[PDB]
Amino acid sequence: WGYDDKNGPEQWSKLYPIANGNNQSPVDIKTSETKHDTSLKPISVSYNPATAKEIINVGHSFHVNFEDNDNRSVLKGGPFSDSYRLFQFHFHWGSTNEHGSEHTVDGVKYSAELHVAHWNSAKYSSLAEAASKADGLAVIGVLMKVGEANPKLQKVLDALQAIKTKGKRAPFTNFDPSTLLPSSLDFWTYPGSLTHPPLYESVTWIICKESISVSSEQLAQFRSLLSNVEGDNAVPMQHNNRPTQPLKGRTVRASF
């Protein structure tokens, strides 16, 4: 699977029939159809920078992984009763500034999207166990709006020159990804899925209403990563965003 014409999102259903499921992500959030929910607690993140571990080129994207052996780095509150343990963050982007987010709001496409992913350590013993369970994953989505350079991205962008090609990985330490989140953690929540294969319907989404900034030149650093292995023809990672999927009668709830 990938994002090219032949192996891309429009084709994922052939190998992953859940692609056409009832809880697929991302979605367009229509703000006139959201239900303000009075029971939603504020989101609480508490991350320890010593849990940052490694940055990895996974061919279609790059991942920043965290040590997840204990509750040093956790998400609580919002719609959750359970503590969720941080394990990774990553981005999605598009081939130009005009699109690149996965979620949209009232049909508006942003330039990129940050995913901060967690797994339910109250109910499950591992990411591998949690990843296929309806209540297994909690993911914060942040819409990234092209504008002023974002200095909070600096450690992440500076690291990419060490993982330029598929499979390269490097240590990535002493980093608290709560620094990437917007000042307001006002949010939308809905039940959905992973946004690429295996597309499990295991994610409770927390979509921030406030965007964060990113420059044109910072988005170019993402698109200059290479999907090929070292020594092959260079193939830039131009895009990795999935189109929005049908709500199929899900309710998007608003904290605000």
Ligand SMILES: [O][B]1([O])O[C][C]C2=[C][C]=[C][C]=C21
């Ligand atoms: O974009 B993704 O496929 O769906 C959101 C959750 C997640 C978490 C870790 C890696 C990938 C993904």
Ligand SMILES: [Zn+2]
């Ligand atoms: Zn993602």
